[PDB]
Amino acid sequence: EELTDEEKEIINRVIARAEKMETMEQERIGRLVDRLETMRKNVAGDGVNRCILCGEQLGMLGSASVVCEDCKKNVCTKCGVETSNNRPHPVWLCKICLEQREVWKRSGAWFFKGFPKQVLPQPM
Amino acid sequence: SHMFDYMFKILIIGNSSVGKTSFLFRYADDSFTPAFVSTVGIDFKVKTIYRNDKRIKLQIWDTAGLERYRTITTAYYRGAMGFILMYDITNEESFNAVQDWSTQIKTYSWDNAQVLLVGNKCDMEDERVVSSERGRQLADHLGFEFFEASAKDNINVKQTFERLVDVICEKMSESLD
Numbered sequence: 653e654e655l656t657d658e659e660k661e662i663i664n665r666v667i668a669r670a671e672k673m674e675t676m677e678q679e680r681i682g683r684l685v686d687r688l689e690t691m692r693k694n695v696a697g698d699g700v701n702r703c704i705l706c707g708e709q710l711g712m713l714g715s716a717s718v719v720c721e722d723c724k725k726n727v728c729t730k731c732g733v734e735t736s737n738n739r740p741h742p743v744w745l746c747k748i749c750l751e752q753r754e755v756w757k758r759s760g761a762w763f764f765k766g767f768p769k770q771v772l773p774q775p776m
Numbered sequence: 777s778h779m780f781d782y783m784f785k786i787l788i789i790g791n792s793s794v795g796k797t798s799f800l801f802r803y804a805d806d807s808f809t810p811a812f813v814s815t816v817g818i819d820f821k822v823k824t825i826y827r828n829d830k831r832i833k834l835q836i837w838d839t840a841g842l843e844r845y846r847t848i849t850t851a852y853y854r855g856a857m858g859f860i861l862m863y864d865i866t867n868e869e870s871f872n873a874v875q876d877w878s879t880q881i882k883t884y885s886w887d888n889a890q891v892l893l894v895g896n897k898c899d900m901e902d903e904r905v906v907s908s909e910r911g912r913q914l915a916d917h918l919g920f921e922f923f924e925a926s927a928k929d930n931i932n933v934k935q936t937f938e939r940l941v942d943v944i945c946e947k948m949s950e951s952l953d
């Protein structure tokens with residue numbers, strides 16, 4: 653490597669205001685993640701005979717049903733969202749997985765396939 | 777939680793003096809300065825844009841090209857979603873270095889990382905030493921998109937960042953089934 657006079661002083665500043673931005677980013681993401689967990693805790697069904705979200709039975713009870721492309725469980729058309737692009741046979745998503753995707757995108761986790769930790773401290 | 781949907785981290789890398797910072801100051805504040813103040817390590821700017829029906833906050837990092845700050849600048853690669861690898865169209869060496877920076881990116885960054893090869897200073901057609909056909913040819917060989925632009929004469933610069941952003945957006949959209 654090499655030495656570094658006050659350069660560190662010039663760099664640590666950038667670092668400092670970058671770490672402050674990281675704190676706020678954790679709060680923005682934190683809220684999104686927490687809201688999602690709450691939704692998960694409210695699952696009342698099993699996804700087999702009774703819808704995974706609400707818990708109402710499916711079948712001859714007059715409740716239409718579909719399978720969610722992401723969690724593979726059965727969801728009623730009420731707790732489900734028909735997604736559609738430019739191709740027939742659209743995929744369905746239960747409300748929780750739809751929000752899951754929104755979180756995976758807005759937080760950047762879709763990139764790292766998870767939440768990473770960039771610990772770049774300041775060289776005193 | 778502020779007013780935006782996504783936040784893309786972008787790094788601009790390449791040999792010293794190729795015009796990385798200028799490219800930034802022109803996109804952020806729209807200001808060119810013939811002066812040359814080599815960047816100390818790293819620095820960044822934030823800019824929110826509205827594109828593809830989404831509010832996107834861009835955290836654009838400007839890295840030092842000198843081999844001196846390699847370790848500190850490479851440390852910030854792993855967080856990047858997109859790179860702008862530029863060289864001077866009037867400097868053979870900076871263009872010869874591209875292959876290396878490409879390696880540098882493969883090593884310290886994730887896989888989805890999108891890369892755009894930018895040949896800067898296309899205003900200095902008098903001192904041009906690298907032909908468009910060569911840059912393009914290299915870009916195709918590295919799997920990168922190619923743009924020739926100029927910070928000084930605000931040309932093809934916004935179109936560079938906008939292509940980066942859209943490229944990243946499409947990789948996002950592709951990462952979901």
Ligand SMILES: Nc1nc2c(ncn2[C@@H]2O[C@H](COP(=O)(O)OP(=O)(O)OP(=O)(O)O)[C@@H](O)[C@H]2O)c(=O)[nH]1
Binds near residue numbers: 840
């Ligand atoms: N003619 C011309 N000159 C440019 C252009 N962009 C930058 N320059 C000049 O190129 C020189 C260096 O610019 P910088 O933007 O400082 O380049 P840099 O690579 O970020 O420098 P390092 O931080 O040391 O890596 C300056 O003297 C600028 O005025 C351009 O598009 N055209």
Ligand SMILES: [Mg+2]
Binds near residue numbers: 796797815
């Ligand atoms: Mg600079």
Ligand SMILES: [Zn+2]
Binds near residue numbers: 706727728
């Ligand atoms: Zn239901």
Ligand SMILES: [Zn+2]
Binds near residue numbers: 723724725745749
């Ligand atoms: Zn689901």
